[PDB]
Design a binder for this molecule. Structure first.
Ligand SMILES: CC(C)CCC[C@@H](C)[C@H]1CC[C@H]2[C@@H]3CC=C4C[C@@H](O)CC[C@]4(C)[C@H]3CC[C@]12C
Ligand SMILES: CC(C)CCC[C@@H](C)[C@H]1CC[C@H]2[C@@H]3CC=C4C[C@@H](O)CC[C@]4(C)[C@H]3CC[C@]12C
Ligand SMILES: CC(C)CCC[C@@H](C)[C@H]1CC[C@H]2[C@@H]3CC=C4C[C@@H](O)CC[C@]4(C)[C@H]3CC[C@]12C
Length: 1350
């Protein structure tokens, strides 16, 4: 059962954390209306969760008012997601608004499949919030059906499908309202007839917001609130809002128009229907450069709109047509998806294209491109930005993009961003770290804080193994194993502590050395510093990638850095130990754990592989690389690391074994056999000079090298132990004297020296636990203990005979252990050593044989002893009789003569004529016994040995190869002098320790390899690493499975190509099948405050017609009546019309182009307009009596696609002119203005063009603009159909066209609306333009002159 929530985490307005507050306290801010009349309203009692049939999960619902804040509703959705999925839920990087048809519609299956596939891919990759209407009809129901499969096929996080619906139309509203909130799991009955509503809610939507205004059955109350919520969500999550238009009626066109106007991009699904097909045609008409769109015309679009929506009136059709053409004006904000052009799997690419055309900046576009997993798009965008001189923005956003690529596990994107000159060690954290009192932590660079941010961000996720690893580690902040609190928690995932955790994971004495001092600016001049900074940075990132088990990024950082082999071994050890750990146990963590083991093996393979390649190329150089001491792991070589990582595969390799055997012999040629080194040992001056060598300067150096060799110390220890065995053996065989003899004193000194060496090893080397673990140290302790017990037994009373006998008895055991201990030196041999390991394995079979024989031995022995002597008291002799002869009869010594004597049988035949008949059963029992022991048990032991031997021979060989290094390491650190004389070595070490600790008169000296040989080793290792990876990749591509898989995919691609072929075929099938005028101005005068003219019909406008019923209204605007400089005087007397007239000595164009001319009224002296009646006398808004000369500047260029081809419509080339949107009435118009005093059309045209299209106004661009402005042609001088025109003042225009044939000069113009223009843009010229006044006639004249489309 589901427990109702009592408290909710509401995110703060600062966006930093969530505060917990009661549900009843939070919900008070939402209101509901009981009736339409109500405005203030009452609190909402309708909120909770709804349970829908055949749906497992419940959907939350909140009924809120129209006046309610959309931020509060956004907080509600965030609170629900925060409760269900935890605080660290996947934030949306995309808001998908689905609008369209309210009524039900059927789409084609392929188109539906393409939309469904693309929308599911986009939604699951970006964690997008899909906002629809929420009702169970049409596009909302369709979107629900698309997201239903996403909710079924995917686990954990499901992207919300928010439905915002009006409450006044919803079935079942009263049931939802009445009750005590919250209603947990309330049943919704969509088929129940709740009067008078017939609209049900979609059952596949994950949340519901019911917006109420008190009305009933009045749809569309929530359209604005929905737009406000989408905009609010987009600002809050810094995510683009993408509207998707499928189908769609007349209101969808206005919705899409609203969406474009607010800057929100739209994706129109072509082939769906109605508004979408109309919008798709219209865009294709205004932008697409393909050959099949060249036949597109407005007439056919108008025909399409008329046949599809069927308007009642022509004005409605005109308004729909104007709005439809207005939507696709800006090509960036509209993206049309079509099946026959883009493709079935290209809808998410179209969504990404809309996103890239929406927000213009490199960082947002690259982050979204990462989210959709389109590297090619990101690569092309980066290349285009690189070519166009946008390198600064690239460098400014590359870090944040690289950080984002690391967080979301995208290695290919990591490789891309790193390739475009982004330094790996220049990473910066997103937040700012607070200052810390610790000097080690304050020394840390920026990229360390960036790695700390990656650890923190990954760690805050639910059920993360990193948090368990850090908590179970039981360490402080700097990683030391010591177990205030606030720092220890805010910076718990620092890099030093993580380095310490990984160090414990490798072994007990692994300590990685960091040097962050090299990242200061003072070291930049040092040669090769950029490599070192790179390498260290790479290493730290590498370790982070090993911890999160991301193999691909780990492999990438491993290949970027250096010291490949050692890093692979360390990685293998950390992953193998990490997979079997307390932090990774759990039912849900199983598969990753598995992954870890897999990854471990892979790294191990790498470590072996590279090494192998090295041994193929140069054996000596490979030997040199394995001997190199590396500073980062406390100055020791790769074999030491490999032993610490327990890499049995690496140690058993022939190259590694060759270096271990080269370390043996102390690097000399002729020292190879036992006899050669033994002969050279005894005879130093007679075999060493005449031998291959790798003055007192040289002979002394070779002597110090030969006797410093570990093999020589082994030979010295063997010879020493052999003399000890021989001398102790003679001592125990020869009789003891009546006093302590000289040989006894020599043996006493020898065993004290041995005892002191064992104590020195215990206190000063490994540890007591480590010493006792070894079996040979235990044997050493037993032999010293036995000798001292025997020696003190003799020395207590030397003349006592009994003491001599007991002392030799103890010393018998001493000689047995001494000769048994001599076997320890057999382990160095390649023949005797593995066999010794095999003997220790076969001891369990020996124990099995002993347990089985013991049964038969005691059973037969008690029975036989009782049978031989049935009338004897039990004594110690009875017990010996039970074990003596039974045990020795299994080795073939049968005491049948002795048994015959004991049985008292006097016959010649062996057990006849006996005193008792029972004793005649003595040979029968024996007969059974030796059948059991010799024929059965011994032969089974032979069978067990053969089986055991075959099983553990290879493992014994591998274990011997690890022990070869162990023995080499052991005899490297050992004291130089042999056992009897080691006391001198002990006193020498004590003297050095006293002189070093107290005296401080000496130090340690060593040799450091040059940088030349170091970079030589580094180059070799890097080259062979690349060579092994190439060989490994080629070998994996030549496998049979890979070839079968690749041929299979090729056959799949072949069908795909046939599918394309069939589409082209069906297209021909279709192709072959089809192969067989008076102007009357509006009544209300503009900008006059509602003053209206005298209305006249269009058949009464001409001046030739009489029209006696004419009573115009005299109105003059306040602006004209205030008398500015460009306005003529209110009294028109003394002014001459029909000729160029001089005002203040400057000529103005007062002559009209009308053939009749301007007529002067006799009564008032005012001029009369020759272009017809306008129902208004006076000057109105026009400043000049008669002809107001205006100049219009049509700056044109050919509309070209990026490829360079000119766009073509109706068989004519299409022009494009700069058009401005007027400030006063928000209608688009041609830029222009009245001709000033003393100037011509050239100056007026240029000044108006600079003022309107350019606003404020260089260098070359000014020269291009001057070159474009130097060739203008007066195309027309006509009368304007301007609504401010009256009978005594009318506008007459001169049109000047500035055409850019090449298009170079026009492309440098930065269009930006200024003065009395709101926006300016390039707009294609056509006959369906809704422009101000008679500017269509002027463009018609421009296109007529240039033979362009109209
Ligand atoms: C761990 C192993 C190798 C050591 C075995 C212990 C040996 C050294 C000890 C343990 C018990 C000892 C025996 C105990 C009793 C006696 C009886 C005495 O009248 C003569 C010596 C003799 C026979 C001892 C000889 C030494 C002895 C066998
Ligand atoms: C126990 C199973 C395996 C087989 C049984 C065989 C036993 C019961 C048989 C085999 C050999 C037999 C013995 C052979 C001969 C003699 C001599 C006779 O004057 C008295 C009985 C005596 C001493 C027999 C006693 C029973 C005996 C021990
Ligand atoms: C193939 C193998 C198992 C052959 C079997 C041999 C058996 C049947 C033989 C071997 C030795 C024999 C024993 C040898 C000696 C004596 C003592 C005699 O006073 C009675 C019979 C008795 C006790 C025999 C019984 C049978 C005997 C146990």
């Amino acid at each position: 059962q589901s427990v109702a929530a009592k408290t909710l985490l509401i995110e703060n307005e600062d966006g930093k954390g969530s505060t917990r507050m009661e549900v009843q306290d939070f919900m008070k801010r939402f209101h509901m209306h009981a009736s339409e009349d109500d405005k203030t309203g009452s609190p909402s009692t309708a909120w909770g969760t709804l349970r829908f049939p055949t749906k497992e999960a419940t959907a939350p619902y909140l009924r809120l008012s129209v006046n309610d804040d959309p931020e509060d509703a956004l907080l509600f959705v965030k609170a629900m997601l925060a409760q269900k999925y935890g605080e660290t839920y996947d934030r949306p990087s995309l808001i998908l608004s689905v609008t369209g048809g309210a009524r039900n519609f059927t789409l084609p299956p392929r188109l539906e499949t393409a939309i469904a596939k693309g929308l599911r891919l986009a939604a699951q990759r970006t964690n997008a919030w899909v906002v629809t209407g929420g009702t169970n009809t049409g596009v909302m129901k369709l979107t629900g059906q698309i997201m239903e499969a996403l909710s079924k096929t995917q686990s954990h996080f499901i992207p919300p499908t928010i439905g915002i619906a009006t409450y006044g139309v919803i079935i079942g509203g009263d049931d939802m309202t009445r009750g005590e909130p919250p209603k947990i799991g309330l049943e919704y009955e969509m088929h129940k007839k709740d009067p008078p509503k017939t609209t049900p809610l979609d059952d596949n939507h994950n949340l519901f917001l019911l917006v109420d205004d008190g009305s009933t059955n009045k749809f569309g109350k929530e359209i604005k609130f929905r737009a406000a919520f989408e905009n609010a969500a987009g600002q809050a999550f810094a995510a683009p809002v993408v509207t998707i238009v499928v189908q769609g009626g007349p209101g969808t066109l206005g919705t899409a128009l609203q969406a474009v106007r607010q800057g929100t991009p739209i994706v129109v699904v072509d082939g769906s229907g109605l508004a979408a097909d109309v919008l798709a045609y219209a865009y294709n008409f205004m932008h697409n450069p393909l050959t099949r769109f060249k036949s597109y015309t407005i007439d056919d679009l108008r025909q399409k709109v008329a046949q599809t929506f069927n308007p009642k009136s022509s004005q409605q059709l005109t308004n729909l047509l104007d709005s439809a053409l207005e939507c696709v004006q800006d090509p960036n904000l509209v993206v049309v998806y079509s099946l026959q052009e883009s493709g079935i799997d290209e809808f998410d690419d179209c969504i990404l294209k809309a996103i890239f055309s929406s927000q213009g900046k490199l960082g947002n576009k690259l982050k979204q491109a990462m989210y959709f997993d389109q590297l090619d798009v990101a690569k092309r965008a980066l290349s285009e930005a690189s070519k166009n001189g946008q390198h600064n923005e690239i460098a400014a956003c590359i870090n944040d993009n690289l950080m984002a690529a690391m967080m979301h596990n995208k290695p290919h994107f990591v490789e891309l961003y790193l390739g475009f000159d982004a330094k790996i060690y220049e990473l910066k954290p997103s937040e700012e770290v607070a200052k810390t009192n610790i000097t080690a932590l304050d020394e840390l660079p920026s990229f360390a804080l960036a790695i700390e941010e990656l650890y923190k961000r990954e760690a805050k996720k639910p059920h993360s193994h990193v948090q368990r690893l850090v908590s179970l580690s039981n360490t402080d902040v700097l990683g030391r194993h010591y177990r205030g609190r606030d720092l220890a928690n805010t910076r718990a995932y620092n890099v030093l502590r993580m380095d310490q955790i990984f160090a414990r994971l490798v072994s007990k004495d692994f300590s990685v050395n960091r040097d962050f001092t090299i990242y200061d600016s003072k070291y930049d001049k040092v040669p090769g510093i950029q490599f070192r900074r790179t390498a260290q940075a790479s290493h730290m990132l590498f370790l982070w990638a090993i911890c999160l088990d991301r193999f691909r990024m780990a492999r990438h950082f491993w290949l970027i850095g250096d010291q490949s082999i050692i890093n692979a071994l360390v990685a293998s050890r950390i992953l193998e130990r990490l997979s079997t750990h307390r932090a990774l146990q759990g039912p849900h963590l199983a598969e990753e754990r598995a992954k870890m083991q897999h990854n471990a093996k892979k790294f191990e393979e790498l470590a072996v592989g590279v090494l192998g390649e090295c041994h193929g190329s140069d054996s000596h150089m490979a030997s040199e690389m394995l001997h190199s001491k590396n500073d980062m792991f406390n100055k020791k070589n790769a074999i030491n690391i490999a032993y610490d990582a327990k890499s049995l595969a690496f140690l058993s390799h022939p190259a590694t074994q060759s270096v271990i055997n080269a370390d043996w012999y102390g690097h000399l040629k002729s020292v190879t056999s036992f006899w050669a080194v033994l002969f050279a040992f005894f005879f130093p001056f007679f075999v060493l000079p005449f031998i291959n060598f790798s003055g007192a300067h040289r002979l002394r150096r070779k002597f110090a090298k030969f006797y410093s060799a570990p093999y020589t110390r082994f030979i010295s220890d063997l010879l020493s132990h052999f003399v000890l065995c021989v001398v102790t053996s003679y001592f125990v065989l020869d009789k003891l004297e009546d006093t302590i003899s000289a040989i006894e004193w020599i043996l006493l000194v020898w065993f004290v020296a041995l005892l002191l060496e064992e104590l020195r090893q215990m206190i000063f080397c490994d540890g007591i636990a480590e010493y006792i673990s070894d079996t040979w140290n235990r044997l050493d302790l037993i032999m010293i203990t036995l000798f001292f017990v025997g020696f003190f037994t003799h020395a207590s009373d030397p003349s006592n005979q009994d003491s001599k006998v007991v002392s030799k008895g103890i010393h018998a055991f001493l000689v047995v252990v001494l000769w048994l201990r001599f076997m320890r030196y057999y382990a160095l041999s390649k023949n005797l050593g593995p066999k010794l390991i095999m003997m220790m394995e076969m001891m369990k079979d020996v124990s099995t044989f002993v347990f089985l024989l013991l049964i038969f031995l005691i059973g037969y022995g008690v029975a036989a002893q009782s049978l031989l002597s049935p009338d004897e008291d039990f004594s110690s002799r009875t017990f010996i009789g039970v074990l003596f002869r039974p045990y020795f009869q299994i080795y073939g010594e049968l005491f049948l003569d002795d048994l015959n004597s004991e049985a008292n049988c006097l016959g010649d035949t062996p057990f006849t004529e006996c005193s008792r008949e029972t004793v005649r059963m003595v040979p029968f029992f024996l007969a059974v016994y030796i059948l059991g022991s010799n024929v059965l048990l011994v032969n089974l032991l032979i069978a067990m040995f053969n089986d055991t031997y075959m099983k553990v021979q290879e493992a014994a060989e591998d274990l011997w190869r690890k022990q070869n290094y162990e023995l080499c390491a052991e005899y490297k650190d050992r004291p130089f002098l042999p056992a009897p004389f080691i006391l001198l070595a002990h006193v020498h070490m004590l003297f050095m320790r006293l002189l070093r600790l107290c005296g401080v008169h000496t130090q340690e000296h060593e040799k450091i390899q040059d940088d030349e040989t170091k970079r030589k080793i580094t180059t070799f290792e890097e080259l062979n690493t690349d060579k092994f990876l190439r060989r490994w990749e080629r070998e994996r591509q030549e496998m049979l499975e890979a070839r079968v898989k690749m041929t299979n995919d090729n056959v799949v691609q072949a069908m795909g190509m046939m599918d394309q072929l069939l589409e082209h075929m069906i297209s021909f099938r279709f192709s072959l099948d089809q192969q067989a005028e008076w102007y009357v101005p509006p009544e209300e005068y503009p900008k006059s405050g509602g003053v209206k003219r005298y209305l006249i019909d269009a058949s009464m406008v001409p001046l030739s017609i009489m029209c006696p019923s004419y009573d115009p209204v005299e109105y003059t605007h306040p602006s004209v009546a205030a008398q500015p400089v460009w306005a003529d005087p209110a009294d028109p007397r003394k002014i001459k019309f029909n000729v160029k007239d001089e005002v203040n000595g400057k000529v103005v164009d007062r002559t009209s182009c009308h053939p009749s001319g301007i007529s002067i009224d006799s009564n008032t002296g005012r001029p009369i307009n020759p272009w017809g009646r306008t129902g208004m006398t006076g000057r109105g808004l026009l400043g000049k009596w008669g002809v107001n000369q205006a100049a219009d500047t049509v700056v044109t260029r050919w509309k070209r696609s990026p490829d360079g081809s000119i766009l073509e419509r109706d068989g004519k080339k299409v022009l494009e002119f700069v058009a401005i949107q007027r400030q006063d009435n928000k209608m688009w118009a041609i830029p222009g203005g009245f001709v000033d005093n003393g100037e011509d059309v050239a100056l007026t045209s240029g000044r108006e063009f600079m003022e309107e299209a350019l606003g404020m106004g260089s260098a070359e661009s000014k020269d291009s603009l001057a070159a474009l402005f130097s060739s203008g042609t007066i195309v027309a001088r006509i009368y304007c159909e301007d609504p401010r025109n009256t009978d005594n003042a009318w506008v007459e225009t001169t049109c000047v066209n500035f055409h850019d044939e090449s298009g170079r000069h026009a492309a440098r113009l930065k269009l930006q609306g200024g003065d009395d223009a709101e926006h300016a843009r390039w707009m294609m010229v056509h006959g369906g333009l809704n422009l101000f006044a008679s500017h269509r006639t002027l463009l018609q004249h421009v296109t007529s002159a240039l033979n362009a489309y109209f």
